[PDB]
Every structure is written in C-alpha cells, then in structure tokens.
Amino acid sequence: THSHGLFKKLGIPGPTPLPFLGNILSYHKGFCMFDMECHKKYGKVWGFYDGQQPVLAITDPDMIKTVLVKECYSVFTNRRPFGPVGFMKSAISIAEDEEWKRLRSLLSPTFTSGKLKEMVPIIAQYGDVLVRNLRREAETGKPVTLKDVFGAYSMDVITSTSFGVNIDSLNNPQDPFVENTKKLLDPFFLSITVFPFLIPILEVLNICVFPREVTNFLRKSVKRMKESRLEDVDFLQLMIDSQNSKALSDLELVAQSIIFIFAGYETTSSVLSFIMYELATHPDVQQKLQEEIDAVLPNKAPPTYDTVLQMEYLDMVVNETLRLFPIAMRLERVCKKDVEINGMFIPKGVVVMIPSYALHRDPKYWTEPEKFLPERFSKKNKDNIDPYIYTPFGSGPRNCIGMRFALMNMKLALIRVLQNFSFKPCKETQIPLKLSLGGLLQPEKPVVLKVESR
Ligand code: HEM
Ligand SMILES: CC(C)(C)OC(=O)N[C@H](CN[C@H](Cc1ccccc1)C(=O)NCCc1cccnc1)Cc1ccccc1
C-alpha cells in the first residue's frame, strides 16, 4: 500500500485503491466494463493498481504510437509477467529485451506472405473436412455449437501447419495428439496479482501454468519429428531450417511451437464464432458476402491466396467483428525507464495499457459503436479510422506476428463454409450475445445456430 500513492502524486486520476488488493475488486464485471467505465469517468488517461502494481491507461493516439512504435526498443519493450512459466520463459511472446529481439528476428521470415502463400493448399484441405462435418449436422437438422466444429477446424489447421500431423479431430477427438493440444480472472491469477511474490516460489518448484504433462509430451513429440524428418512446408520445418545457420536452440524451438498452438487455437476458433453470430443475426450482411464469394469463385470454386485478398466485403466483415470483439482486450508494455512521452512523466516500472475493447466501442471515434456495421471498413470510410484506435493485432515491433496467417486462416474457413451453408438463429441462440464477465473475450453462453445446405 506504499506504492498506492503513485498516481495521486503525479496528478493522474483513478479509482481509489484498497490495501493490498489495489482496484482488483472492480474486475467483478470484467476487464472491459471496468475499462469502459474508467474511460468515461476519468478522461484520456487514468491509473489503477493490480494489487501493488500501478497501471496507467492511455487513450491518446499520439501517445499510443509513442509507446507501441516510437519508444518500443528504447522503453516499452516487454509485456508484464503473469505467472510461473518454466522452460517457456523462451517463448517469443513471453521473452524479454534482447532475447525477444533475437527470437522475433529468427521467427519473422516464418510469417512472410511468401511462406503464407505456400500454406494455403494445406489450410484449404481441412476447409473441405470442415464442410463434411457440418453437412453431417445439417442433414440431421440439429443446431450446431460453433466452438466445437470451428475448434475442430482451427485444431486441424494448427497440427498441419506446425508439424505436418493430419487428423480429423472432430472425428478423432481422442487421438493422443489432439488431447494434449486442447488442454488449459480465475482463482489462480488474481492470487498471482495480490501475491506476485509467489511466482519465484512456483518457479523453483517447477510448477508451470503450462500443465507439465502437455509440455513434456510435445518436447518429446517434437524431438521425434525432428529426428524423423532429419533425415528422410510447416512452421517446425521453417524453424528447423532456421537453426541451420545466435540460432534457435532445441528447447527454444519446442517453446515457440507451443506458443503457436495456444495462439491460433482458441483465437482462430473464437473469432470465427463471433463472425458467424453476427452473420446469423444480420442475414443481409450474410447474403451480401455469399454474393461476393460466388462472384469471385463461381461454382463453389476453391479459394486461392490471391482470390482471398480480392474479397473486400469479406475483409470488412472480419475487420468489423474484431472491432466488437478484439480478443486481446488490452495491449500492455512495461515501462523500463523514467520517460516523458507527449508531455507526461511516466516513472520506471509502471505497466502502460491500451484499452482496446474500450476504444473499439468509444462513441467519440465510432458512430453507433454497439451496432455491427461493416460499412465502417468500406474503402470509402476505411481511411477515416485511426490505426491507433483500431488495434486488433497490436501495433509496432511487438504487434501480432501471426496476423497475416490468422486473417487468411479465418477467411479460408469462411469462404468454404458460406459457399455451402446458410446460418440462421435458433430459439436457443443468445440474442443479444452477452460477453463473459470472466477473463477472456468469449460469450457467456456458447453460440448455437441452425445450419442449412445451399
Ligand atoms: C484473430 C486472431 C488473432 C488476434 C486478434 C491476435 C491478436 C494479437 C495481439 C493483439 C497481440 C499483441 C499485439 C501487441 O502487443 O501489440 C498478439 C501477439 C502475438 N500473436 Fe497474435 N493474434 C491472433 C492470432 C495469432 C496467431 C494465429 C498466431 C500464430 C503464430 C499468433 C502469434 C502471436 C505472437 C507470437 C504474438 C507475440 C508477439 C511478440 O511479442 O513478439 N497470434 N496477437
Ligand atoms: C501480458 C500478459 C500478462 C497477458 O502475458 C504476456 O507477457 N504476454 C502474453 C503471454 N501469454 C499468452 C497466453 C498463454 C496461454 C497459455 C500458455 C502460454 C501463454 C500468449 O503467449 N499469447 C500469445 C498467443 C496468442 C494469443 C492471442 C493472440 N495472439 C497470440 C502474449 C499475448 C497476450 C495477450 C494477447 C496476445 C499475446
């Protein structure tokens, strides 16, 4: 409670913190509502405390640019640590300073458009697997839970694009490879924020927020694949070729592989559910997209890398969905030095925070922000959108490295699925969708819809 004076001293407003707890009791409605509220109550900048940890929110796009881009390497290089990580210290998204700068370099060529175009044929084949599982549920007019069928697809793309493994997860939901990979503001991480001194305790104990079993399975599963291709197109290959030179270690390689799975599993699948919900409760947008897809790919023509970038309304739909549901919710950098940015003094050790969800729904930049209106991303209006207000993939050197992959992956899933099906609300569909009051951007109730064969 000896750090709870910091914002009062700097003249920064914020809600008054309780001893030890900081302002965390105010997460009872979740990060995003607390963010929105703070924005409205306090203005362009405010402070609060995760326990003893001062956090300064900022919403000025100049200041956001300074932090995210201009002063990334100098000052705002790392995210705030969260729990016991074990050997995953070496994962790119968790690593810090120069080890991050080295991993980011070693892994950037992996995510070029040129490597992505080579992955389209592989991400296409499981779009076909996706249709056949959906059609089995459309001919038996039973409502569908998107997260299971989309999760099966995202999961199918990940194992293929990162290791070559080819499974029909929805039908082999219990192959050993599919088991490990799916697993694990909850009672744990709040305790971490009130007792962050307990992290080094769990480290020496080898306790990990990564189930020690999943990680042991893939550490060895990778070293089998590694020594089965060596010697006799995916992320593992691209990393194995990179350490054929400063170059990527062996346990370092396992760790990035693991980050890529958590990265694109719950995210690629969660997003596709958000887009199918909006498509269902807005059937004209849904028709408008089916017309655009049939126009570029007549006769259910299979999508190609080039035809995907041809589809503008598709891009508009995806982009608007991420405005209502930016699954990061917040961006964050730890300030590593006393700094002054855009006229404001920022003391060393503050976490700086961009409240994405809240800025995506700000009426001061967005007309009717709670409404799903894709036209805001029309080539006409897309110019009047501040790229430091709309940030579903972050920005600057530490933006989402897998952005071009994620967009492509989702767009391929959509094109095939709208080439073949229409999606209609059920009586059991939650309208309007309520967001989880928990710690992830997800729906209260899972999205259930009706699927019909075109
Ligand atoms: C629609 C899906 C996704 C969204 C909305 C998303 C969003 C984000 C955001 C907002 C960040 C933080 C950006 C920042 O701090 O400025 C991030 C980081 C990251 N994402 Fe994504 N992401 C998605 C999917 C993926 C996928 C599929 C991968 C596959 C490899 C991936 C890999 C990463 C990595 C490695 C980072 C950490 C970057 C670093 O610290 O160097 N993400 N993502
Ligand atoms: C700032 C704080 C305290 C949250 O944690 C960090 O220090 N940074 C994050 C590290 N933990 C997560 C989740 C995870 C879960 C299980 C095991 C390991 C990791 C992480 O690895 N995300 C990358 C994967 C990912 C996820 C969604 C979009 N893109 C990529 C990186 C991060 C965080 C939030 C959004 C984006 C990226």
- Residue 123 sits in a domain whose CATH number is 1.10.630.10
Whether the ω angle into residue 81 lies within 30 degrees of 0, i.e. cis, is: no
Distance, CA of 252 to CA of 248 (rounded, Å): 6
Distance, CA of 376 to CA of 316 (rounded, Å): 8
Is 400 known as a binding-site position?
Answer: yes
Distance, CA of 225 to CA of 160 (rounded, Å): 13
Contacts of 226 (CB under 8 A, 6+ apart): 236, 240, 250, 253
For 139-186, where are the alpha helices, taking DSSP H only? 146-163, 176-182
Regarding the beta carbon of 331 and ligand 1, being less than 6 Å apart is answered: yes
The helix/strand/coil state of 145 is: strand
Distance, CA of 326 to CA of 206 (rounded, Å): 33
Phi, psi of 61 (to 5 degrees): -65, -30
Distance, CA of 273 to CA of 268 (rounded, Å): 9
Ligand 2 atom closest to the CA of 262, numbered from 1: 24
What is the helix (H) or strand (E) element at residue 448, kind and residue range?
A: strand 448-453
Distance, CA of 213 to CA of 199 (rounded, Å): 20
Regarding the beta carbon of 407 and ligand 1, being less than 6 Å apart is answered: no
- CA 93 to centroid of ligand 2, rounded, Å: 6
Please give all residues whose beta carbon lies within 6 A of any atom in ligand 2, as ranges: 79-80, 82, 93-94, 210, 259, 262-263, 267, 328, 332, 400
* Number of domains forming the structure of the chain: 1
- CA 149 to centroid of ligand 2, rounded, Å: 24
Residues 210/85, Cβ–Cβ less than 8 Å:
yes
For a pocket test of ligand 2, which of 80, 93, 327 has the largest count of ligand atoms closer than 8 A to its C-beta? 93
Residues 319/275, Cβ–Cβ less than 8 Å:
no
Distance, CA of 127 to CA of 12 (rounded, Å): 50
Dig out the tokens for 443 from the structure. 């729906």
Distance, CA of 119 to CA of 247 (rounded, Å): 24
Domain encompassing residue 70: 1-454
Residue type, 409: N
Regarding the beta carbon of 120 and ligand 1, being less than 6 Å apart is answered: no
Regarding the beta carbon of 69 and ligand 1, being less than 6 Å apart is answered: no
- CA 263 to centroid of ligand 2, rounded, Å: 7
Phi, psi of 84 (to 5 degrees): -70, 125
Contacts of 391 (CB under 8 A, 6+ apart): 64, 68, 326, 331, 354, 356, 359
What is the helix (H) or strand (E) element at residue 46, kind and residue range?
A: strand 45-50
Across 53-160, the runs of DSSP E, i.e. the strands, are 53-58, 144-145
The helix/strand/coil state of 424 is: strand
- CA 85 to centroid of ligand 1, rounded, Å: 18
In total, the chain counts a number of residues equal to 454
Residue type, 17: P
Among candidates 26, 91, 12, which has minimal Cα distance to 54? 12
The neighbour count for residue 360, using CB atoms within 10 Å, is 22
Maximum pairwise Cα distance, the chain: 68
Q: Give the ligand whose atoms come closest to the C-alpha of residue 388.
A: 1
Distance, CA of 305 to CA of 112 (rounded, Å): 13
Dig out the tokens for 359 from the structure. 């800025």
Residues 92/256, Cβ–Cβ less than 8 Å:
yes
Regarding the beta carbon of 394 and ligand 1, being less than 6 Å apart is answered: yes
What is the helix (H) or strand (E) element at residue 200, kind and residue range?
A: helix 199-204
Experimental technique, in short, is X-ray
Regarding the beta carbon of 92 and ligand 1, being less than 6 Å apart is answered: yes
Q: Give the dihedral of Cα atoms 38, 43, 48, 53; nearest 10 deg.
A: 130
Among candidates 331, 318, 329, which has minimal Cα distance to 382? 318
What is the helix (H) or strand (E) element at residue 47, kind and residue range?
A: strand 45-50
- CA 403 to centroid of ligand 1, rounded, Å: 6
Q: Give the ligand whose atoms come closest to the C-alpha of residue 92.
A: 1
Distance, CA of 39 to CA of 10 (rounded, Å): 18
What is the helix (H) or strand (E) element at residue 104, kind and residue range?
A: helix 97-107
For a pocket test of ligand 1, which of 393, 405, 441 has the largest count of ligand atoms closer than 8 A to its C-beta? 393
The angle subtended at Cα 22 by Cα 20 and Cα 27, nearest 5°, is 125
Nearest CA to ligand 2 atom 25: 263
Q: Rg of the Cα trace of the chain?
A: 22
Nearest CA to ligand 1 atom 7: 393
